[PDB]
A paper describes a structure:
The ribosome translates nucleotide sequences of messenger RNA to proteins through selection of cognate transfer RNA according to the genetic code. The bacterial ribosome possesses universally conserved functional centers that are structurally dynamic and undergo local and large-scale conformational rearrangements during protein synthesis. In particular, the small (30S) ribosomal subunit, which is responsible for decoding the messenger RNA sequence, undergoes rearrangement of the universally conserved monitoring residues A1492 and A1493 in the decoding center, as well as a large-scale domain closure that involves movement of the body of the whole 30S subunit closer to helix 44.
Here, we report an X-ray crystal structure of the Thermus thermophilus 30S ribosomal subunit decoding complex to 3.45 Å resolution using data obtained at ambient temperature at the Linac Coherent Light Source (LCLS). Microcrystals of the 30S ribosomal subunit were soaked with 80 µM paromomycin, 200µM mRNA, and 200 µM phenylalanine tRNA anticodon stem–loop, ASLPhe oligonucleotide, resulting in a slurry of 2 × 2 × 4 µm3 size 30S decoding complex microcrystals (see “Preparation and crystallization of 30S ribosomal subunits for SFX crystallography at an XFEL” section). The crystal structure of the 30S decoding complex at ambient temperature adopted the canonical decoding conformation, with the h44 residues A1492 and A1493 flipped out toward the minor groove of ASL and mRNA pair, consistent with the cryogenic data. In the structure presented here, the hydrogen bonding interactions of codon residues 1–3 of the hexauridine in the mRNA-ASL complex were markedly similar to those observed in the cryogenic temperature crystal structure, as shown by the clear positive difference density for each base pair in the omit Fo-Fc electron density maps at 3.45 Å resolution. On the other hand, residues 4–6 of the hexa-uridine were disordered and as a result not modeled in the cryogenic structure, while a well-defined electron density was observed in the ambient-temperature structure. The 16S rRNA residue C1397 was captured in a different conformation compared to the prior structure, pointing away from the disordered hexauridine in the cryogenic data set and involved in a stabilizing interaction with the mRNA phosphate group of residue 4 in the ambient-temperature structure. Presumably, the conformation of C1397 adopted at ambient temperature stabilizes the interaction of the 3′ end of the mRNA oligo and as a result decreases the disorder in this region. The comparison of our ambient and cryogenic temperature structures therefore illustrates the intrinsic flexible nature of C1397 even in the presence of tRNA at the A-site. The minimal binding differences observed between the cryogenic and ambient temperature 30S decoding complex structures suggest that ribosomal decoding complexes can be probed at cryogenic temperature and may still be representative of what occurs at ambient temperature.
Residue numbers in the entry:
A (entry chain O): 2 to 89
B (entry chain R): 16 to 88
C (entry chain F): 1 to 101
D (entry chain K): 11 to 127
The structure:
RNA sequence: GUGGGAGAGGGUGGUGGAAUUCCCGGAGUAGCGGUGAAAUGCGCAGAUACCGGGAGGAACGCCGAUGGCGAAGGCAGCCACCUGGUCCACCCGUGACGCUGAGGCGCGAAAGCGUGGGGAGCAAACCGGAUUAGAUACCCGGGUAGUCCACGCCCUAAACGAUGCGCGCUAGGUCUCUGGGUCUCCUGGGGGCCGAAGCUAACGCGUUAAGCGCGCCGCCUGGGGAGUACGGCCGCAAGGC
């Protein structure tokens, strides 16, 4: 699964300020954690499509968050990507 | 309509999740090996749901039977 | 690393030496699969509600352990090898849910 | 010529026939009867009277072995079940117990079209 | 975000008992089976019924329900690992980041197709027995594909609530599932029945709208011809759109 200590680790890594639990970056980064863990779950168990649903939904919400940030502050958007390593 | 007795009020403090406690799970099985319905047990939805699984757990172990023969018919 | 409960039902016909060997093998297999044993109940020979391996009795053991989850099904695998052992069932521990309280 | 004097009386009832198998306490059979052992041939074998005659002929066959006490075990739902019971119940044999061991699966096999739904 | 809840939601490995069939042994005799009645069939190479052992395939009785889960198809013995969705309390954080959605992509009961396994029971086709005026059937005895497994196809349906998705507004009573709380009761999510206003051609719907409103998609335009022909795209084919 995903332990609360890993969760705290990534939150605190991406928190804009101490106590930031809800920023765009914290969200995108959490979804990135879950997405990568689910993709690793789906290299095995490629016959489990009901989870694969949850995967498409996660990617979708992450793309909406990134499109939002892209609109509002392209600096933090590129910074986010450069940290997470997404878009390719 | 099971106006003879209800098994829960025929019992005191007990743990529904104890698969190893026979002398109580015994009380929830019928004269055959079958699991009693809520008419007799008087359990609730959640209660009968969990007791079911702990009885099945007990059946695998050989503590409760899967089926019995009917006597006296 | 989670908290489990190993149930073992083995042959009721074993004299003290062979059974002691089997318990030894249980301890050893645990040390090999990383089972920190928190407590143990030895219920011993006990009547079975149906014959298992044609024997109307079985010898019961129970271990509340803590071990890596990723190696649980491996461990059970090993425990099933001994002919003396006729039932293996591993279970995640749970908080007791009480009725008529 | 065994001199058993005590055994088990199996009853296999069905909607087509009723057949009695009388055994030693271990379960090995001594004698037996059914609707076809008596002169009944067609559908009459599935009668409570045919059952009665079958169980009586079984009990009388077993008297020749000097059997007194039996435990009865019924299997199958079908006419003549309870009539074979009552035939043995005062057949001369003493019925020590009646037990219904009719085999039921746990949803094992697919029945014929006849038995589906 | 935090902290708790519930579930046949999904994948993989492992595993438990009942039953059927078959094989072995024991005991035992003249039939069993089956039907409206029968016959075919099976049985003296010893069947049926009965006890003991063994093999294998499939399916999980009671629990179980007017119950739950899921987007749909659909999901039910148990254990473990991996994994999806959801609900509540707290008012903590982000600051309109929202809704819908042509095309696309993924999923998609059964049956059906390719390879390879498996094959107990059931069973299209087929072979018999009956019935009938006939009986290419309904009934009975057999039986191949198939039903099962891995992988790849196929893409349909009375795929049904015959009711697209989201959000706001509009009496209640009651049953139930699952939370929370000052736990007679209050409060949130889900499933039922009856009904206010209202709507409807009627049937009926009625806070789970088929009411009152807004947003976006899909679709209809008399019956037959016809889901046919042609063209195109897809498919191993059947065939699909
Ligand atoms: N999912 C399998 C089932 O899990 C049951 O237990 C399940 C639930 O009771 C339990 O609920 C958990 C829990 O942490 C708490 N109640 C809240 C939490 N959101 C839930 O976790 C949920 O969300 C996550 C993704 O975030 C999913 O991966 C997970 O499947 C889901 N249960 O999580 C478990 C896993 O889903 C039983 N073991 C059994 O019915 C069966 O194994
Ligand atoms: N075996 C448990 C289940 O197996 C599923 O798939 C399993 C089975 O479908 C498949 O066949 C197995 C195998 O041991 C071997 N080929 C033969 C064996 N009889 C089968 O096992 C099972 O078969 C069927 C279901 O198919 C069950 O009804 C039956 O209880 C069981 N014998 O083997 C797979 C595992 O190797 C899924 N993994 C999951 O649902 C679950 O773990
Ligand atoms: K056969
Ligand atoms: K079924
Ligand atoms: K339902
Ligand atoms: K409460
Ligand atoms: K109606
Ligand atoms: Mg969405
Ligand atoms: Mg073993
Ligand atoms: Mg007959
Ligand atoms: Mg499940
Ligand atoms: Mg033999
Ligand atoms: Mg012949
Ligand atoms: Mg001869
Ligand atoms: Mg011959
Ligand atoms: Mg047989
Ligand atoms: Mg046997
Ligand atoms: Mg075979
Ligand atoms: Mg039911
Ligand atoms: Mg739904
Ligand atoms: Mg629903
Ligand atoms: Mg349905
Ligand atoms: Mg606030
Ligand atoms: Mg602010
Ligand atoms: Mg959408
Ligand atoms: Mg589309
Ligand atoms: Mg399909
Ligand atoms: Mg199919
Ligand atoms: Mg095939
Ligand atoms: Mg094949
Ligand atoms: Mg073959
Ligand atoms: Mg064959
Ligand atoms: Mg057949
Ligand atoms: Mg047939
Ligand atoms: Mg014919
Ligand atoms: Mg006619
Ligand atoms: Mg073929
Ligand atoms: Mg449907
Ligand atoms: Mg419908
Ligand atoms: Mg409805
Ligand atoms: Mg519905
Ligand atoms: Mg609607
Ligand atoms: Mg629809
Ligand atoms: Mg939405
Ligand atoms: Mg409601
Ligand atoms: Mg429902
Ligand atoms: Mg109404
Ligand atoms: Mg009105
Ligand atoms: Mg009316
Ligand atoms: Mg509405
Ligand atoms: Mg159209
Ligand atoms: Mg249309
Ligand atoms: Mg026209
Ligand atoms: Mg048309
Ligand atoms: Mg068509
Ligand atoms: Mg064409
Ligand atoms: Mg082609
Ligand atoms: Mg055709
Ligand atoms: Mg063509």
């Amino acid at each position: 699964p995903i332990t609360k200590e890993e969760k705290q680790k990534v939150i605190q890594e991406f928190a804009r300020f101490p106590g930031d639990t809800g920023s765009t970056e914290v969200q995108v980064a959490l979804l990135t954690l879950r997405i990568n863990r689910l993709s690793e779950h789906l290299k095995v168990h490629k016959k489990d499509h009901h989870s694969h649903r949850g995967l498409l939904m996660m990617v979708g919400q992450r793309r909406r968050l990134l499109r939002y940030l892209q609109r509002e502050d392209p600096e933090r958007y590129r910074a986010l990507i450069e940290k997470l390593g997404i878009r390719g | 309509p099971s106006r003879k007795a209800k098994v829960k009020a025929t019992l005191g403090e007990f743990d529904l999740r104890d698969y190893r406690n026979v002398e109580v799970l015994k009380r929830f099985l019928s004269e055959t090996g079958k699991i009693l319905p809520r008419r007799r047990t008087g359990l609730s939805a959640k209660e009968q749901r969990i007791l079911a699984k702990t009885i099945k757990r007990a059946r695998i172990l050989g503590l409760l039977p899967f089926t019995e023969k009917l006597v006296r018919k | 690393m989670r908290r489990y409960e190993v149930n073992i039902v083995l042959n009721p016909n074993l004299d003290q030496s062979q059974l002691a060997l089997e318990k030894e093998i249980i301890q050893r297999a645990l040390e090999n699969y990383g089972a920190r044993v928190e407590k143990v109940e030895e219920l011993g020979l006990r009547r079975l509600a149906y014959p298992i391996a044609k024997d109307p009795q079985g010898y019961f053991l129970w271990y509340q352990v803590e071990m890596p989850e990723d190696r649980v099904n491996d461990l059970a695998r090993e425990l099933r090898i001994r002919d003396n052992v006729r039932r293996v069932m591993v279970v995640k521990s749970q908080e007791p849910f009480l009725a008529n309280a | 010529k065994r001199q058993v004097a005590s055994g088990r009386a199996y009853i296999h009832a069905s909607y087509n026939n009723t057949i009695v198998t009388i055994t030693d306490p271990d379960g090995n059979p001594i004698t037996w009867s059914s609707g076809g052992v008596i002169g009944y041939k067609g559908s009459r074998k599935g009668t409570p009277y045919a059952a009665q005659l079958a169980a009586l002929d079984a009990a009388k066959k077993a008297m020749a072995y000097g059997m007194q006490s039996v435990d009865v075990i019924v299997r199958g739902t079908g006419a003549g079940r309870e009539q074979a019971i009552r035939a043995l119940q005062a057949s001369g044999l003493q019925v020590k117990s009646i037990v219904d061991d009719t085999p039921v699966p746990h949803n094992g096999c697919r029945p014929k079209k006849k038995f589906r739904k």
